[PDB]
Amino acid sequence: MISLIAALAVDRVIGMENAMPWNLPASLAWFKRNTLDKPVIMGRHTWESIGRPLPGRKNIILSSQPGTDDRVTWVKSVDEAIAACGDVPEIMVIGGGRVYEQFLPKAQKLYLTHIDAEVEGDTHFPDYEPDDWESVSSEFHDADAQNSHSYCFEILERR
Amino acid sequence: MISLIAALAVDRVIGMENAMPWNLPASLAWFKRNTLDKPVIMGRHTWESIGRPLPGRKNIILSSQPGTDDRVTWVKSVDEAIAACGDVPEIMVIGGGRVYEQFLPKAQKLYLTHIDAEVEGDTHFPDYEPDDWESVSSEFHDADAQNSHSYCFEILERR
Ligand SMILES: CN(Cc1cnc2nc(N)nc(N)c2n1)c1ccc(C(=O)N[C@@H](CCC(=O)O)C(=O)O)cc1
Ligand SMILES: CN(Cc1cnc2nc(N)nc(N)c2n1)c1ccc(C(=O)N[C@@H](CCC(=O)O)C(=O)O)cc1
Ligand SMILES: [Ca+2]
Ligand SMILES: [Cl-]
Ligand SMILES: [Cl-]
Known part of the structure; x- marks a missing residue:
C-alpha cells in the first residue's frame, strides 16, 4: 500500500528547494513515528534538505541525476522505486511536489x-478531492514555546 | 569581559509569544561555536525555550524565583550571575530582552x-548606538535547503 506523507501550509503550498519558515x-x-521501519521514497531536493539518510528507514531517492552517496538507493523511475522497496506492508512517499504527483494515482493513504x-x-500539494478520500482522523494543536505555528495532523483513506 | 549574543529579526525583534518562525x-x-566552553547567562523564559542545559557550557539562570533543575546554577542578581562565572575571560549573555537590558552597559562585544x-x-533587542560600536566582521548568507531565511553574522566591539 502506498502512502503519501506531507506538511502543507495554507493553500497547499509545500516546500520546493529552500527550507520552510517554521x-x-x-x-x-x-x-x-509514522515512517520508522518502512521504506521512504523522496526526490533530490528533499534529500538535500534532510541532509543524511533517515535512520531506521530504507532511503530511496527518485532522480534523473546520478547517485552521489552509497548509503541510500538511487532509482530513475517509479517502477524502479517501487521495486526497491520489496514486499512490505506500507511504502511512504515523502515528497517533494513532482514525486507526490507521480504516486498520488497509486496512493491509498x-x-x-x-x-x-x-x-x-x-x-502545491496536488489537488486531492476529499470525496475520493475519507478523512478518518484529525488532531489540532496550538503553537507553543517550541512550535512556531498551530498544526493539525490528518489521516485520510482512499475511497 | 561580557559579550552579548543574539538573533535579531527585522526591527530588532528577538522573541514572540511562540517559537520563532524560522x-x-x-x-x-x-x-x-561562539558559546562553547564558556559560561552562558540567560533568563528563565530563554531556559524554558531551550528545553535542556546547553552541553559543554556552564549554564547560569538569572531569575527571582527558585530553581527547578539541579543541572544548572540558579542566581538572583546580576552580581551573583557574574560571580558564578568565576575567572574566565569572557562571559556570554544569551537573552532574553530584560537580561540583555541589564548587561548591555557592561558589554564590550x-x-x-x-x-x-x-x-x-x-x-526586542535593546537599542544600540551604532556610533558606540565598531563592526569588525560580517558574513552574508542566503536561505538554502536547510535554512529558511537569509542571515548575516556580525561581530561588534565597543568603541
Ligand atoms: C526537510 N525534511 C522533509 C520533511 C519534513 N517534515 C515533513 N513533515 C511531514 N509531515 N511530511 C513530510 N513529507 C516532511 N518532510 C525533513 C528534515 C529533517 C528530518 C529529520 O531529521 N527527521 C528525524 C527526526 C527529528 C530529529 O531527530 O532531528 C527523523 O528521524 O525522521 C526529516 C524530514
Ligand atoms: C531557542 N534558543 C535560544 C537561541 C537561539 N538562537 C540564538 N542565536 C543567537 N545568535 N543568539 C542567541 N542568544 C540565540 N538563542 C536556543 C534553542 C536551541 C539551542 C541549541 O540546541 N543549540 C545547540 C546547537 C544546535 C543543535 O545541537 O541542535 C547548541 O549546542 O548550542 C540554542 C538556543
Ligand atoms: Ca568594519
Ligand atoms: Cl524533492
Ligand atoms: Cl528570558
Whole structure:
C-alpha cells in the first residue's frame, strides 16, 4: 500500500528547494513515528534538505541525476522505486511536489500536517478531492514555546 | 569581559509569544561555536525555550524565583550571575530582552545574527548606538535547503 506523507501550509503550498519558515518539532516527531521501519521514497531536493539518510528507514531517492552517496538507493523511475522497496506492508512517499504527483494515482493513504502559515510558494500539494478520500482522523494543536505555528495532523483513506 | 549574543529579526525583534518562525541550523551552529566552553547567562523564559542545559557550557539562570533543575546554577542578581562565572575571560549573555537590558552597559562585544524575517514581536533587542560600536566582521548568507531565511553574522566591539 502506498502512502503519501506531507506538511502543507495554507493553500497547499509545500516546500520546493529552500527550507520552510517554521520550526515544528512535534510535527517532525509525528513524521518520524509514522515512517520508522518502512521504506521512504523522496526526490533530490528533499534529500538535500534532510541532509543524511533517515535512520531506521530504507532511503530511496527518485532522480534523473546520478547517485552521489552509497548509503541510500538511487532509482530513475517509479517502477524502479517501487521495486526497491520489496514486499512490505506500507511504502511512504515523502515528497517533494513532482514525486507526490507521480504516486498520488497509486496512493491509498495520506498522512498530512496542516500548518497555519501563509507562505508564498510555487509548488502545491496536488489537488486531492476529499470525496475520493475519507478523512478518518484529525488532531489540532496550538503553537507553543517550541512550535512556531498551530498544526493539525490528518489521516485520510482512499475511497 | 561580557559579550552579548543574539538573533535579531527585522526591527530588532528577538522573541514572540511562540517559537520563532524560522529554521536556521547554520545560525545555531554559529551560536554553539561562539558559546562553547564558556559560561552562558540567560533568563528563565530563554531556559524554558531551550528545553535542556546547553552541553559543554556552564549554564547560569538569572531569575527571582527558585530553581527547578539541579543541572544548572540558579542566581538572583546580576552580581551573583557574574560571580558564578568565576575567572574566565569572557562571559556570554544569551537573552532574553530584560537580561540583555541589564548587561548591555557592561558589554564590550556583541555577536549578532541578523535574519531577514519580517515579524511582529513581543520582545526586542535593546537599542544600540551604532556610533558606540565598531563592526569588525560580517558574513552574508542566503536561505538554502536547510535554512529558511537569509542571515548575516556580525561581530561588534565597543568603541
Ligand atoms: C526537510 N525534511 C522533509 C520533511 C519534513 N517534515 C515533513 N513533515 C511531514 N509531515 N511530511 C513530510 N513529507 C516532511 N518532510 C525533513 C528534515 C529533517 C528530518 C529529520 O531529521 N527527521 C528525524 C527526526 C527529528 C530529529 O531527530 O532531528 C527523523 O528521524 O525522521 C526529516 C524530514
Ligand atoms: C531557542 N534558543 C535560544 C537561541 C537561539 N538562537 C540564538 N542565536 C543567537 N545568535 N543568539 C542567541 N542568544 C540565540 N538563542 C536556543 C534553542 C536551541 C539551542 C541549541 O540546541 N543549540 C545547540 C546547537 C544546535 C543543535 O545541537 O541542535 C547548541 O549546542 O548550542 C540554542 C538556543
Ligand atoms: Ca568594519
Ligand atoms: Cl524533492
Ligand atoms: Cl528570558
